[model samples]
Target: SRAEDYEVLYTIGTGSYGRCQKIRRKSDGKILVWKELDYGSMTEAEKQMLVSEVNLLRELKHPNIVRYYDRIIDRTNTTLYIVMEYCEGGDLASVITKGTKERQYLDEEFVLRVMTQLTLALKECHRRSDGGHTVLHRDLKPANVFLDGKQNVKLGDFVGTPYYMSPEQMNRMSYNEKSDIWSLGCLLYELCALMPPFTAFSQKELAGKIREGKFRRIPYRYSDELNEIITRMLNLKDYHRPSVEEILENPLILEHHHHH
Candidate 1:
């Protein structure tokens, strides 16, 4: 039975590129997020890209990264249904939106958890890459990051924010692990400010603002150490940015490891 193993509960929401549904396994009663990838509109190159992404996703395994369970190809419907783990607590964008509305900032420990856990996930994707051939998240943002029932972070969505793209990316220069660090910085900064590090009225201005790597302070609530970490992550030049290994070795990130 193709899609019969899981019972659809409801539509979760639609991705700009696809659709999603909340579902449960028929036999085990376990919940999952079912993503509908309609390939009817994709070009040959795009289809190949999607295929490679699936191949990459299937091999990636980390606690902080969303698990890819199964994918069912429907030739008749011209769609692909991807099954993945469910995070009952939902995504970080919603959490930040709620916290912003309530004027409640994420506490230090929660922020630390976000930092430590996400970096660990990055380590798997970045350092493991062989120089030019390494995998990059390409699209990393609070919306892509999910929170579990315990409010733990898990990277769910594969995507980006103009807010998170590094200066190199903004300049149309080559991107590497450093670009990812910039995005990670955006996530941490958002946790403190309840907004992206940079925002602007126009694409030209947004690109201008990103190139300079200037943004508001994260606020007095978070430690200066964290602020500095964010600053280094958003290094104006990619060469100055820390590799995932360097980030993991930093005292601020390393301290969280012992605490955990």
Candidate 2:
């Protein structure tokens, strides 16, 4: 199928690669995100990078993660079209951005719900595949609609936003899943605070701040228990950062997992 199965809705955003659109499937009338990539705009080397992410996205299966449904490559126009799931609730950045303007902070329950879902998503991503390859979300900012570092690079995007980046990542050292864990902490902190935990005008300045790993406390409405989770995940030492499995084992997370 070459995109005839789905009717185009509207453009959501645009970039080096044509644009990101909202579309509706003709057969099922299901809404989905439509990604368009123009080969004419890509270097031959970068072509494989985008395709690599396409393969990666197709293999991922999780309720909290974006789902890939179909892809169509039109030789006539040399374009690649990808149909993926859409989140009605919108991305986390928009939700938090709205809250910031209204001075509304997320309650513990709401934050916990998102935190639990993301933790599960992380577990699935880090699990070993047949080749013993575990995917680490090199880019885990609160704003990313998908977990893809290669896609960002190919599309002339920042590999990872400094706000959500871990100490080792900022240091340009070999990184592991703990880097994603650090970003998860940043997401949790921003949920309550409505802004990044570490903010600065320059990337260099941001690095030192993330390296220091200090930030103003989240709203007092949240418990020390919740704060401790943030603290542990944001530990400057990569070794101190907890794994998704460790996060799942927490009593607070376990209770939520069991009930519903």
Candidate 3:
């Protein structure tokens, strides 16, 4: 088995579904992240969920999105191997979440820069014109976005986090690219103010609040331009939500990014 040939490398990160390890490609010495899925005790549905995520990631490619390199299925051990890009800077969540407790919110200029890049990426996904198969990154919190060595923003983990999920996600209702915009609004609010719009005791509680359209108002200290952008992005009535195209047309987004 190929399993016997690989060495245990240092751990990199962990999430609800699995963990990633930093390892050197034994044959070529090239470094990569190896995300192993331990299906040991998962119900059949959970196993299928991971497989679906891996498959969707394989079909997506964007500079602002994590790259999926390969997938290896080990039937003998009931594990799945997913090769992905090595993000040295880690997820944005670690930074913004920490900044919140420390009372040091991220600079507005930097936050806007990251949001501009992420918005363009979402626009590309929405432009695919694949009907119901469009990719909607249901989770857009700080942790799911990453920074490269150059400090550029890269979106990761297309799947939704259990708590920050949108109304459609919570209710199993259909959604589209606009779902990403909603999450992005939540993230921009978090980054600028260092607080999440919705908070509760559990995922269930959070979902209920979101379904009832109970997100917090945008903080007043932020610039009027910033406030306007987030307000539109976080629109509660799903059908009335702006598409990434419409978002790009907003004066707020265009004003800050014209020089870039």
Winning candidate number (lDDT): 1
Q: What is candidate 3's lDDT per residue for 1-260, written digit by digit as tens?
A: 25443555788768855887787667776676767777878898977876776776677777777777767677887777777787877778788767867887677677777778888778657665443346667667788888777767778766343545666666687766767888888888778777777777777777777767756556665788787777677767776777777777765564645223
lDDT for residue 93 in candidate 2, whole number 0-100: 73
lDDT of each: 0.81, 0.73, 0.72
Each candidate structure's TM-score, on Cα atoms with residue i matched to residue i, is 0.91, 0.86, 0.79
Name the regions of candidate 2 deviating beyond 4 angstroms.
Answer: 15-18, 41-46, 128-132, 145-161, 254-260
Query: Weakest 10 consecutive residues, lDDT, candidate 1?
Result: 251-260
List RMSD in Å for every model shown. Answer: 2.8, 5.2, 4.1
- Flag regions of model 3 displaced more than 4 Å: 1-7, 39-53, 129-133, 159-163, 169-172, 201-221, 254-260
> In angstroms, how far off is 104's CA in candidate 3?
2.1
Q: What's each prediction's clash count?
A: 1, 0, 2
The TM-score between candidate 3 and the true structure equals 0.79
- Tens digits of lDDT, candidate 2, 1-260: 87788888888898544688899999889988777877877787888787777676577776667777889998888888877766565567776888988887876876776677777777777884434347776767666643222211010111444677777866788778888888889888888888889998888888878777789988898988888888799899988989888888776775653223
